[PDB]
């Protein structure tokens, strides 16, 4: 079977969310030195912002094909599924996500993009995957505080939810799903909340410190990864 047909068949299995079929087809390709077909499929999934690319990577990771994730995907997939300490860098502003020191009552610590620190232990996070009902979700754990990223129930006048770090994962407010995207050579992700299906963003409003508060944004983000998406960098 020609490579373009193998590409087609692999890509369709992922888009319909038959991950076991996608894993099986991938294993065959990778054994037969046709990593070009897998890489081409991943690149297409990302061009097309297909969320199912995350589940595909995760099932390869779980089903004994971590080598395929390492070798055929942007480095970010490795970083996510290996639970590497990473930095979450907002493409628009080049700021690292962090948590405040003081605890804002039952809300937890405030999440924000730090105006200055893009490098200390405060800006380290890890993604912790879980599978449910044919989807992969993530808890996003701050390394220093052992607190999880969450949206609060409250909203501003736009219907945006504030983001916080809290002690445990008690509800879908503390779980997230990812959608891949591209800007130039950089692979990015929209990061959506499971409870409210809003994208994690940084405020356009600057604090005098240069900090920007983090919010679950009530608005359109797709098509504008350079405004609303996140890079994942090795810490
Ligand atoms: K073959």
């Amino acid at each position: 079977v020609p490579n373009d047909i193998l590409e087609e068949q692999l890509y369709n299995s992922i888009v319909v969310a038959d991950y076991d079929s996608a894993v099986e087809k991938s294993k065959h390709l990778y054994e037969e030195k046709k990593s070009e077909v897998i890489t081409n499929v991943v690149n297409k999934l990302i061009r097309n912002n297909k969320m199912n690319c995350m589940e595909y990577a995760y099932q390869l990771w779980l089903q004994g094909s971590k080598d395929i994730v390492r070798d055929c995907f942007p480095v970010e997939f490795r970083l996510i599924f290996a639970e590497n300490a990473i930095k979450l860098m907002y493409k628009r502003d080049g700021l690292a996500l962090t948590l405040s020191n003081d605890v804002h009552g039952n809300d937890g610590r405030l999440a924000f993009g730090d105006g200055k620190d893009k490098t200390s232990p405060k800006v380290s996070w890890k993604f912790i995957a879980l599978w449910e009902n044919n989807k992969v979700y993530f808890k996003i754990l701050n390394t220093e505080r052992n607190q999880y990223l969450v949206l609060g129930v409250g909203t501003n006048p736009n219907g945006d939810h504030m983001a916080f770090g809290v002690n445990s994962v008690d509800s879908f407010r503390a779980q997230w799903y990812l959608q891949p995207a591209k800007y130039d050579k950089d692979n990015l992700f929209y990061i959506y909340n499971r409870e409210y299906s809003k994208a994690l963003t940084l405020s356009r409003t600057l604090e005098t410190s240069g900090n920007r508060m983090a919010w679950g944004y009530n608005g359109r983000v797709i098509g504008s990864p350079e405004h609303y998406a996140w890079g994942v960098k090795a810490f």
Side-chain angles (χ1 to χ4, degrees):
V1 197
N3 277 12
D4 64 281
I5 308 192
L6 300 169
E7 284 166 2
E8 172 183 305
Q9 287 174 350
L10 177 56
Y11 183 83
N12 292 341
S13 70
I14 298 159
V15 167
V16 309
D18 183 350
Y19 302 115
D20 294 351
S21 179
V23 173
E24 192 151 46
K25 288 172 179 308
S26 297
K27 281 183 182 292
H28 307 150
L29 293 163
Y30 189 77
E31 178 75 24
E32 288 189 357
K33 303 297 297 189
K34 293 181 187 176
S35 290
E36 295 85 352
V37 171
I38 302 162
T39 303
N40 283 349
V41 165
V42 172
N43 290 353
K44 187 176 176 90
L45 294 162
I46 294 173
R47 284 198 295 278
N48 288 148
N49 301 316
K50 293 306 199 177
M51 292 189 307
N52 290 6
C53 189
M54 311 308 304
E55 282 80 8
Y56 170 49
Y58 186 48
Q59 285 303 328
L60 291 172
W61 198 262
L62 289 186
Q63 292 189 44
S65 286
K66 301 175 166 46
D67 55 1
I68 302 187
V69 177
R70 294 188 204 117
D71 284 352
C72 299
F73 288 66
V75 64
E76 290 83 0
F77 290 82
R78 193 175 44 80
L79 299 178
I80 292 172
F81 290 111
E83 313 189 358
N84 276 74
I86 56 82
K87 297 171 187 170
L88 290 167
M89 298 301 310
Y90 202 53
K91 179 58 161 189
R92 180 54 163 182
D93 308 305
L95 310 182
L97 193 72
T98 194
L99 296 176
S100 64
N101 288 336
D102 208 357
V103 179
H104 296 233
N106 304 1
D107 302 324
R109 292 187 166 84
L110 307 186
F112 62 93
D114 195 285
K116 283 164 178 180
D117 181 18
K118 172 197 62 79
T119 44
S120 84
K122 292 199 175 279
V123 305
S124 173
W125 299 77
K126 290 174 173 195
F127 286 86
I128 318 297
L130 60 110
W131 189 250
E132 191 155 54
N133 292 340
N134 213 44
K135 298 176 70 33
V136 66
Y137 299 100
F138 301 90
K139 297 162 176 93
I140 300 178
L141 180 65
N142 181 261
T143 307
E144 175 161 325
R145 291 307 185 173
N146 288 124
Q147 294 183 308
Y148 293 95
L149 192 71
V150 72
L151 296 188
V153 176
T155 61
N156 69 9
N158 187 57
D160 309 325
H161 295 257
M162 280 170 84
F164 298 97
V166 295
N167 287 155
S168 58
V169 177
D170 275 35
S171 93
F172 296 159
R173 290 189 293 110
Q175 295 184 34
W176 307 84
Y177 57 96
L178 267 55
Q179 178 181 30
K182 196 133 175 164
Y183 199 65
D184 283 70
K185 288 155 174 124
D186 309 282
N187 290 97
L188 300 169
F189 302 90
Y190 305 100
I191 298 184
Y192 294 102
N193 191 252
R194 184 174 183 182
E195 183 88 4
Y196 292 118
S197 297
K198 309 304 187 187
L200 184 70
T201 59
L202 296 185
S203 185
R204 299 290 87 214
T205 294
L206 274 174
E207 300 305 317
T208 62
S209 60
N211 297 344
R212 295 175 182 274
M213 285 175 46
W215 293 85
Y217 173 52
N218 186 31
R220 157 175 203 152
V221 296
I222 194 78
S224 295
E226 79 282 7
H227 293 276
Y228 302 118
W230 289 91
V232 171
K233 306 307 177 175
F235 174 73

